[model samples]
Target: DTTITQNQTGYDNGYFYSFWTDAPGTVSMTLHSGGSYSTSWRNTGNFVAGKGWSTGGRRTVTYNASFNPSGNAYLTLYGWTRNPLVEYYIVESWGTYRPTGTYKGTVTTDGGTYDIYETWRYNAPSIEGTRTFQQFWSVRQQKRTSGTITIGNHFDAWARAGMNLGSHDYQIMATEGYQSSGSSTVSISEGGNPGNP
Candidate 1:
């Protein structure tokens, strides 16, 4: 089954899609700047039995779109871990924040070459309550508005660096706009490698 939902706040809109497996999906949004953050996403993927997520099959997403300010359109791959509550992300492009963590070095993945950084955010609200955690980001060197990112490779690279997220909960492909003030038309499709289950 496939499901879609939307959330709007302060003039910003977010759309989400959930799938039973890796398959094609798409979402689009228009955003207005008002201290709001909006995103369109699909949080679904397979987690290995006990080895953590770095050892999963390849999952790929194709993005085709245009945006005003360019940076307003972002592509992100994210998952969670909970020893001290950390969020793992492989953001393809970003509209906010520079490298805030110490340069951990770089890793080349099927998605592309990423410059790794270790950072932390404090007091982020969650259903469990307020939490502070670390963020390990393997950010792409270039901003790609339309292209593909093979997510499995990023996980593999991060794992090699000893970044463990305990066990994977879910994986998502998303488009986020922060303080955005414009519109866009986007269509994304995700698919898995031939042998993935």
Candidate 2:
């Protein structure tokens, strides 16, 4: 039961977990000995299942979470890339406010439809330190607690949207809270979904 109040990333519980907060907040993550974690947060914070680099070929992700938020929060697949420099999100579920963009269009994959959004960050913090970059988003139309995310499929769709991705970087299943409080028991498996390409 490790309680994190600042920023950190490391290997733990037979896996990697990352805590990165951009605001004043207290977030605690109790990582299981394996891959599951239970977490709670006050104010704004981000907690993630750290699947580092090219784990993308791990391809598919099946996730289940007991997610509850008292204000704005998101259940998302998040990561970054270099070269062209991009930050991306595949939002599975959210509370109160949804992360929005200019609404590029929509993408349908793994039995669900998602709205695509594109936005630019002006010198916000990123995996490569403080830098301006583009953010690609695919926000699910229907919120869910459990589901499959075909990561490559989303990437394919984004490419179709004319979005360019550079080299892969750290990727994760993340829970984020903004100006709020929340808790979740998050469980997920990667690279082992049936018929994963």
Candidate 3:
């Protein structure tokens, strides 16, 4: 019922999507942009299809990147859940606004620091259904184009700031390029014990 790819378990033409059904899964991708109209999702599960991160155990995710964006572009760890009314979480945002909330505070994770902002949208229509959810963005004060970033650290930092929502039915490390012209290669290595970038 959608044009985007689904149930993908490994790398594709810069797109990765899968389900945690039966057991958890992981994916990685190297993105290439074709000017202003390039879009890709390096993530797990279908958000509208009711996919999410599983409960129990230590589910660790990591993203290491060597990227370059030519215009209004960004990369971030995005997540959401349909636990009734839907609750969205932005573990990290590496680009510009569209902020509709207040700047809560800041937190440190791994060896870096980040600022927290809480935002929400109501009666938001989606292919799934009418929805509303809170969005918590963890903006890295100091951007890094090349380095290892532990996604869980971002979650932990946000959780420390009281931003924990549902079980996050779906999650993704996505790069959105708007009027952008360039390329970016990202490495999403092994889960739990991720390797080098």
Candidate 4:
């Protein structure tokens, strides 16, 4: 359930686009915060089961793996919003075990560069008392036909505003378990996490 103390405390925008097969057969996910638009599923159906099988907003961001995520990694789409944008947090997750190595992070929709656990503060006066939106979507270029992406694994992630008296919301995929041999390619979108500051 998503609640809000104000009309527009926070907002999120992104898409969940993936066509994973029962190949590796497992997808892990997680999330922390976003806004009223926590997360919604769409356009889905079963290739094997055609009766009770359907797609189009029948699922919410899941914390458990329905199958395994082994083989290739699918692109994830996700992001969040906050007040004034002077300071905030951006919780995150990885499809595979992310070692303590520097990886590429970006502003999702802006395509700006980011770092692991990177702290960014909005330019004062430049974005003061102003509202902004961020999107984090990824594209898949793998060669497989079996995968699934619900929500995120069960993990808690938190980020702090780079400044004082400010709070923002974000989204990330949590891993519940292990990815299967053929299970690979899971995309994260800005659908989960709907908390207000």
Error (Å) of candidate 4 at residue 126 is 22
Which of the numbered candidates is closest to the native, going by highest lDDT?
Answer: 2
Cα lDDT tens digits for candidate 3, 1-197: 12223333332333333322111232222233311112333332222211113231123545555445444445555555454333443333343433335777877765677777877767764324566666677767776654445666656766777777554454555554443333444444335433222
- Model 1: lDDT equals 0.48
Best-matching candidate per TM-score? 2
Question: What is each predicted model's overall lDDT from 0 to 1?
Answer: 0.48, 0.76, 0.45, 0.25
TM-scores for candidates 1 onward, in order? 0.60, 0.88, 0.58, 0.22
lDDT of 4 by residue, 1-197 (tens): 13211112222233321122222222211222321122212121111100000122212343322223332222232323344343222223333543232223322212222233333333321123433432222222232222333322111111221222223333333212223232222333323454222
Residue range 74-143, candidate 2, lDDT tens digits: 8888888889899889999998998887977888997899999999999777878999999999999999
Distance from true location, Cα of 96 in model 2, Å: 0.8
Q: On a 0 to 1 TM-score scale, where does candidate 3 land against the true structure?
A: 0.58
How much is the lDDT of residue 181 in candidate 4?
A: 30
TM-score of 2: 0.88
